């Protein structure tokens, strides 16, 4: 019917123009997606680098924290041991040592010197030591005339006195106050 071909060609041109416009817009979108996907991949790659670095610093930190925890626990136990075992300057309850003690120069009680270096130059007394009955209020009769028994009593008490002096000397030497 003569006219269809012009109508058909015209409408095909309309559809061709529509397709042309749609391809252009698709091309615009895909070209812009290209940039965006390229950018996203680059950022993801960069993100993996810093996270990998972070992972490398975390496991190292965890190692150090575990090592530190071990050294504090040891220190805490050494401190506990020292606290139970050390001699205090400020404690008021009597403190006792399981060992001998040596110090320089002096021992003191209440700020006054009571004990010091061993005193030397002694020649040790000989004979009997008297640690028995001793009456320092023992007195003596003295007559107007010579009495043997009265002189004997004086001599006897002089002997018990000298033997008491030796006994005391023995105690100082055995302690070590004198040589």
Positions 36 through 55 that interact with Cl ion (CB under 5 A): 37, 40
What does the CA dihedral 147, 152, 154, 159 come to, rounded to 10 degrees?
A: 170
Cβ neighbours for 6, distance < 8 A, ≥ 6 positions apart: none
d(CA 79, CA 85): 10
Candidates 1, 2, 3, 109: give the one binding a second copy (CB under 8 A): 109
Site string for a second copy, 16-55 (x = CB under 8 A): x--xx-xx--xx-xx--xx-xx-xxx-xx--xx-xx--xx
Q: Please state the closest distance from residue 10 (CB atom) to a second copy, in A.
A: 9
Q: Does 1 bind a second copy (CB under 8 A)?
A: no
Binding mask 3-42 for Ca ion (x = CB under 5 A): ------x--x------------------------------
Restricting to residues 130-159, which ones interact with a second copy according to CB under 8 A? 130-140, 142-146, 148, 150-152, 154-155, 157-159
Q: Does 3 bind a second copy (CB under 8 A)?
A: no
Q: Would you say 85 and 144 are in contact if contact means Cβ atoms under 8 Å apart?
A: no
Tokens of 140: 């003596």
CA-CA-CA-CA torsion sign (73, 76, 81, 84): negative
- For Ca ion, which is the closer residue by CB, 15 or 34? 15
Phi-psi map region of 139: left, alpha, beta (phi>0 left; psi -120 to 50 alpha) = beta
Q: Which residue has the tokens 């075992």?
A: 85
Residue ranges binding Cl ion (CB under 5 A) = 37, 40
Residue ranges binding Ca ion (CB under 5 A) = 9, 12
């Amino acid at each position: 019917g003569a006219y269809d071909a012009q109508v058909k060609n015209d409408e095909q041109d309309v559809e061709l123009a529509d397709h042309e416009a749609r391809i252009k817009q698709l091309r615009i979108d895909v070209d812009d997606h290209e940039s965006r996907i390229t950018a996203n991949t680059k950022a993801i790659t960069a993100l993996n680098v810093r996270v990998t670095t972070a992972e490398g610093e975390i496991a190292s930190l965890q190692t150090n924290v575990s090592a530190l925890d071990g050294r504090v626990t040891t220190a805490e136990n050494n401190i506990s041991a020292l606290q139970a075992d050390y001699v205090s300057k400020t404690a008021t309850t009597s403190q006792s040592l399981a060992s001998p003690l040596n110090v320089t120069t002096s021992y003191s009680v209440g700020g006054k010197k009571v004990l010091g270096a061993r005193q030397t130059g002694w020649t040790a007394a000989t004979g009997t030591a008297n640690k028995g009955v001793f009456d320092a209020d023992l007195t003596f009769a003295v007559s107007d005339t010579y009495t043997q028994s009265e002189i004997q009593a004086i001599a006897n008490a002089l002997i018990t006195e000298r033997r008491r002096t030796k006994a005391m000397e023995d105690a100082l030497r055995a302690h070590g106050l004198i040589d």
